[PDB]
Amino acid sequence: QSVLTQPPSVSAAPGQKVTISCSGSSSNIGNNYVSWYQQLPGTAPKLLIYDNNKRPSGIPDRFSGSKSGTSATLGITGLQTGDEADYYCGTWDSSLSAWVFGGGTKLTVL
């Protein structure tokens, strides 16, 4: 049973780096590539991070992505108000032959 697990929420004040951890069984995230999407309210997911570290098409900087073993980590230096959205992590689970997404974090600025 593989569906990546993500904390229900993460919150920090502006100026404090925000860390989000997506963990899943090594069937899909230990052998394939994570990718990270941002969903602003009432809009459509906007790709944020791809291929386990990269930052496409000039996304606002300080957005970082890393992969450690069977987990993936997103990082934002400081907690800006505009960054408030839902964050999802997606990998191609070959065992299920299906895209699998995380629970989604409600990032709230303190």
């Binding site: 394939n32 590539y33 990718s35 999407y37 969903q39 459509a44 997911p45 906007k46 790709l47 791809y50 291929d51 496409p56 999802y88 997606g90 191609w92 299920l96 032959s97 299906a98 895209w99 699998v100 997404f101 995380g102 629970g103 989604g104």
Partner: protein, 117 residues
């Protein structure tokens, strides 16, 4: 400009049938790997279906058999044939281009779907 616009969403009875459609501009749906993903209100994007350049299709577990994805010959537009609906198909379907199997680059705005009387 790149854009994908989807129509076909509205109220429908359980067991109904719909043809949702994905219209592609600046891009060519008969080539880029196209995907239908959904998100019920207060829920998480769930992969519904991916269409390959070569015509091959993949569908999720919950959405197997009942559904169908298709790629128009000349209209530059793709369509989902949703059949045999139930309560867990209440959704805001999106169509999205996905470089390979790695990441989903472009997302359409969203087309509500409701299963109630």
């Amino acid at each position: 400009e790149v854009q994908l616009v989807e129509s076909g969403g509205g109220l429908v009875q359980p067991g109904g049938s719909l043809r949702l459609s994905c219209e592609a501009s600046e891009i060519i749906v008969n080539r880029n790997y196209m995907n239908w993903v959904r998100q019920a209100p207060g829920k998480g994007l769930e992969w519904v279906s991916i269409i390959y350049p070569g015509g091959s299709t993949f569908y999720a577990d919950s959405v197997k058999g009942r559904f169908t994805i298709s790629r128009d010959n000349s209209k530059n537009t793709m369509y989902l044939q949703m059949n045999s609906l139930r309560a867990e198909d209440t959704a805001v379907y999106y169509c999205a281009r996905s470089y390979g199997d790695f990441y989903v680059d472009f997302w359409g705005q969203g087309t509500l779907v409701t299963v109630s009387s």
